[PDB]
């Protein structure tokens, strides 16, 4: 909904970009410094979020 845009079209793209048609689960051990809760499945985004 663009007020000053053209008439016939309004693209309106989505916020993100991926399909997640298939999923993979990785199970292992962690250390004390980890902040993630134990025994609770959580989604992983990218390597920048790891370590902490």
């Amino acid at each position: 909904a663009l007020s000053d845009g053209f008439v016939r079209l309004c693209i309106d793209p989505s916020l993100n970009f991926f399909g997640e048609g298939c999923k993979i689960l990785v199970e292992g051990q962690i250390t004390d410094d980890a902040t993630a809760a134990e025994n609770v499945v959580t989604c992983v985004n990218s390597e920048l979020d790891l370590v902490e």
Binding site: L2, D4, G5, F6, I11
Partner: protein, 58 residues
Amino acid sequence: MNVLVPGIDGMVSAGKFEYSGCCPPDFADMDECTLATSYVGLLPSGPLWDRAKYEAIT
């Protein structure tokens, strides 16, 4: 008669023309406000620029 005025060649008679109005703008007319917002019109046009170009303030 006329009233003479000093001149490089002695005492001469002076006068005036009538305003023409074909003088290009001088340094004085130029101002930062004048053209700072002006270049916002050099950008392209589309849904990605309409809102941004409208909300330009200085």
